[PDB]
Design a protein around this ligand. Structure first.
Ligand SMILES: CC(=O)Cc1ccc(Cl)c(Cl)c1
Length: 282
């Protein structure tokens, strides 16, 4: 079926939970043996969210190459994304090592450091220009260059230096700051505006490594971001845009990381975002 009318048909019939459970039943199951090794317990935020072995990002290190991060490679859309958990106190250096090694231009953050009164990720970037951060375990230096605070999101320019080689690179930090503590946003307008700002920066384009996107677990809000982006790109590429099937795209993405889209409300919000976004594109 088309999307917008499939949408009203699920609303009128109140069957979002059943649609979402079908997706959960059909989703791929692949091994995640490296994530579960005992030496990696303090590298995982949640015991039930792990990268598959076949798609995990490897650190360029011989001691321990593990990080909780996955490469989502979308062949028809010609887009790639790295989805990862919010960094932990003992993985902030690994996080920036990955950004460096994978040649990423942008980092997309969809959570606040504290939500619901608890810490959802480490403070992994510097908050003042004159107070830079040094990660001694991976030999990197990170400096805040500029910050632009808007009503729904903040954009930061950061300088990452590889201290071994003295090479430097400019990284863009896109921080969506207004996702509610509970539920999903009422309108997708600010989320779509944010997606378009990431696109306009070059961070999603083939001349750079894959964008790094995270929330707390790296599957819920993060899944919504890449699912909406890929669906809108396919609607622009194809002769028949009504052939784009959001459930089929989500199942393809779940071949590369488990659990993408965590609730039926997130599924409905993804439909809403793609529907409204397709009108603005034209
Ligand atoms: C998927 C979708 O409906 C998007 C779309 C955009 C433009 C056109 Cl002309 C058409 Cl038929 C569909």
């Amino acid at each position: 079926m088309e999307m917008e009318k499939e949408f009203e048909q699920i609303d009128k019939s109140g069957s979002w939970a059943a649609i979402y459970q079908d997706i959960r039943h059909e989703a791929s199951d692949f091994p995640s043996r490296v994530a579960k090794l005992p030496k990696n317990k303090n590298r995982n935020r949640y015991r039930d969210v792990s990268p598959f072995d076949h798609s995990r990002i490897k650190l360029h290190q011989e001691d321990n190459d593990y990080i909780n991060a996955s490469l989502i490679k979308m062949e028809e859309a010609q887009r790639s994304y790295i989805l990862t958990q919010g960094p932990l106190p003992n993985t902030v250096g690994h996080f920036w090592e990955m950004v460096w090694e994978q040649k990423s231009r942008g980092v997309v953050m969809l959570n606040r450091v504290m939500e619901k009164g608890s810490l959802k990720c480490a403070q992994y970037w510097p908050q003042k220009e004159e107070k830079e951060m040094i990660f001694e375990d991976t030999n990197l230096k990170l400096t805040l260059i500029s910050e632009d605070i808007k009503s729904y999101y903040t954009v930061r320019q950061l300088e990452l230096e590889n201290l071994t080689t003295q090479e430097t690179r400019e990284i863009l930090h896109f921080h969506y700051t207004t996702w509610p503590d509970f539920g999903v946003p009422e309108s997708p307008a600010s989320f779509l505006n944010f997606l378009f700002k990431v696109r306009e920066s070059g961070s999603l384009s083939p001349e750079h490594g894959p964008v790094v996107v995270h929330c707390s677990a790296g599957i819920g809000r993060s899944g919504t971001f890449c699912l909406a982006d890929t669906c809108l790109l396919l609607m622009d590429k194809r002769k028949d845009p009504s052939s784009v099937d959001i459930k089929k795209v989500l199942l393809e993405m779940r071949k590369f990381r488990m659990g993408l889209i965590q609730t039926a409300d997130q599924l409905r919000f993804s439909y809403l975002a793609v529907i409204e976004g397709a009108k603005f594109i034209m």
